Paper text:
In Rhodobacter sphaeroides, TakP (previously named SmoM) is an ESR from a TRAP transporter and binds α-keto acids in vitro. In this paper, we present the high resolution structures of TakP in its unliganded form and complexed with sodium-pyruvate. Thus, and despite very low sequence similarity, the TakP fold is characteristic of a type II ESR.
The structure of the selenomethionine-labeled protein in its native form was first solved by the MAD method and then refined to 2.0 Å resolution with an R-factor of 17.9% (Rfree = 20.5%). After a successful co-crystallization of TakP with pyruvate, the structure of the protein-substrate complex was solved by molecular replacement and refined to 1.4 Å resolution (R = 17.3%, Rfree = 18.4% ; Table 1 and Additional file 1 for an assessment of the quality of the electron density map). In the second crystal form obtained with the substrate-bound protein, the asymmetric unit contains one dimer with both monomers now found in the closed configuration. In the cleft between domains I and II of each monomer an extra electron density was unambiguously assigned to an ion-pyruvate complex. In the complex structure, the acidic moiety of the pyruvate is involved in a salt bridge with Arg177 and one oxygen atom is H-bonded to Tyr100. The central feature for the binding of the pyruvate to the protein is the presence of a cation. This cation has a bi-pyramidal coordination with a square base.
Author numbering:
A (entry chain B): 29 to 365
B (entry chain A): 32 to 365
Write the structure that this text describes.
Amino acid sequence: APKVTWRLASSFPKSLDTIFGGAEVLSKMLSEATDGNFQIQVFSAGELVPGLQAADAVTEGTVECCHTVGYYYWGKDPTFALAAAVPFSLSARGINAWHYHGGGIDLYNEFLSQHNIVAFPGGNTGVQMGGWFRREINTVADMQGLKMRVGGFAGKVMERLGVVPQQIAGGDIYPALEKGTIDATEWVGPYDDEKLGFFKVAPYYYYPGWWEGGPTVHFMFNKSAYEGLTPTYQSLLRTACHAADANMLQLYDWKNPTAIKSLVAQGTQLRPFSPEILQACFEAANEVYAEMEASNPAFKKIWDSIKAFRSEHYTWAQIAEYNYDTFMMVQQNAGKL
Amino acid sequence: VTWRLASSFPKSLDTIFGGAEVLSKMLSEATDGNFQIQVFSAGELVPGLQAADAVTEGTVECCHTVGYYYWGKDPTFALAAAVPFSLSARGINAWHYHGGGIDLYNEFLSQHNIVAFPGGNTGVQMGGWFRREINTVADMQGLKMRVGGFAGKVMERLGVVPQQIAGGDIYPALEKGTIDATEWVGPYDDEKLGFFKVAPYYYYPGWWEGGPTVHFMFNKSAYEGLTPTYQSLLRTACHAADANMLQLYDWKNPTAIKSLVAQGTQLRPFSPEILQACFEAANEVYAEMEASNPAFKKIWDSIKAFRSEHYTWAQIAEYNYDTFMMVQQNAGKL
Ligand code: NA
Ligand code: NA
C-alpha cells in the first residue's frame, strides 16, 4: 500500500484544467516525487460533497483535504476570505509576496487552526474579469436590481450597490444564466469563462473584476492528517503546493490571451467599468470593511497586515513595473512588436 | 546524491544567491538528507560569470546563473533568461511552463551538456546607477557601463561601452571609476551592493530585463543519472524555488526603494526618446541575429509570438485594475 492515501474534494468542475486541474498537478507532483507512496486522489465538485462546502468536509475529517477558495466560507467568518481575496486587495504577485515572505501563511493558519485546517496557497487566477451581462453597465444605477452570481465576500459589497448576489459553484452557473434565473455572472477570466459558455447568452464582458485582483486558491488540509505526516512528507507537501500555486497562475497566463481572442472572434463585446463605477464600488467596500474590522478582531488582524503591504506594493509597482509594461503595451498597439 | 552547485551570485544577496539555498533545503528536506546539494557562492569554485562552463565541463554537477552571461559563447543562451524588450516575469513563466519554453531551451542546451530549469525571476529590473542625469541618447555616448548579458550589444549601438562583471565585484569598479555607471537588479539588491554612494541617479525601467529568469543548470549526465523519481522532485523543487525568489523580491523591493530614496537616491524615468532609441537598436540587433543564428531564431520567434499575445491581454483586466489601485494609492485612498 502507499505510505499515504488521501482524498481531495475540489470546489471546481472537471472541465477547468486551470483551477480544477491544480489539484491534479499537486497529485502528480507528489506521487512522482515518492514513486507512488504519497497518493492524493482528486474529486471534482459534487463528487464527494458540493463544491461550495468542500472545506466543511475537511474540518469534519470526511476527506483529508480540499482545493477551494477561502471566500466561499465568508458566511461562517469573513476572515476566511482575506487570504483568498476580498475586493480591492493585492495582485497575484503582491499577495504571494505577503503569503510566502510577509507572514501571510502563518497568519491564515493561526486563524484556521480552530477550524481544524492547515492551508497553503494552491493557485492564483490573476486579476479577474468583470463578469458577463446582457446589457451595458455604464453607471452604478445600471447595476441596481441585477441578480448576479458573485463569489465570496464580494456579495456583501454588491448588496450595498443594489445588486442581488447569488451563490453558485462554477459548473452550475451556466444553466442558471441560460434559464434566466440569474441576469449576470462573474467567474474568473477568458479561458475558464469561455469554457463555461456564458458568452452564448450574455455578450457584454466587463473588466476589471475589482472583487478579485489576485485570488489565491488554497489547498486546505485536515489538521490531524497533516500533522500525522512525517516531517519529510510535510516539507514535500509545502514545496509541491508552492510549485502548483505558481503553475496555475502560469497556465492562466498562457491560456487567457488565446481565449480572449476566441471570445472576441465569436462576437463578445469587451467593455471597461467606468472610473465612477470603480470609485463607487471602492467606497462600498471601504464601508463594509470598516464595519467588519470593528466587529471582528481576526478579520482586522489579517486585513491590516495585507493593507500595510498593499500601500507599499502599489507605490513600488508604479516605478519599474508600470513603466516597462506600459511601454510594451504602447509598442504592441503601435504594431511595433 | 551528493552534488556541488556553483552560484554566479554573491553570498550577501539572500534573493538571487539565496535561491540556490532554497532549492538545496527543499531537496534535502523532501528526501531526509538523501539528495544533497552543497551550495557555493560566486568565486568559490569558479568565477561567477563562468559558472555554466564548469557544468558543461563536468567539474560541478550544477550551477545557478543567468543564461545571458554566456551570450559571448552564443546569444541563444540569453533568450530564456532575458534579452531587452522581452516578457514580464509572469509572461516568461507562462512561456517556460506552458508554452514549450523549457523544452525549447533544453533542446538548445543538450549539445552543451546542460539540462536547465527556471530557478528565479527578479521582475522588471531598474534602469541602473549614474553619476549624473541622462536625458538624451547623446548623454549615454561613451559611458563605461556594467551591464548584464546580450544588452551589451544593444548598448553598443547607443555608444555605450559595456562590460560584464559578477555581482560582488561591481562596486569596487564603480568606486575606482573604471566604470561610469552600472545596472544590477533592483532596489533590495542594489542597496545592499551600495552603488548609491557613488552614483546616486537611479533610472527606470531597466528595459534590458523585463523579467529575467535565473536558471538552475544541471550537468546532463548527472541529471540523467537520477532516478525518474528524483528527476521529477528536482523539477518540482525548481518550480517552487523559481516562484519563491520572485516573491522575495516582491516583498523586499517596496521597503528598499523607500530606504534608497531616504538615503539620497534620485529616481529618474528614462525619457520616451531614450526608450524608443533603445527599442529600435534592439530590433536591429535581433533581426541581424535571426538571419545569422538559426538557434537564436528558433527560440526568439517562439518568445515573440507569445509576447504579442501577452501584451494584448495584459491591457485588459490587469492594467485596468493595477492602475486603478495605483491611482488610489497616490490619492491617499488606500
Ligand atoms: Na470570481
Ligand atoms: Na541586470
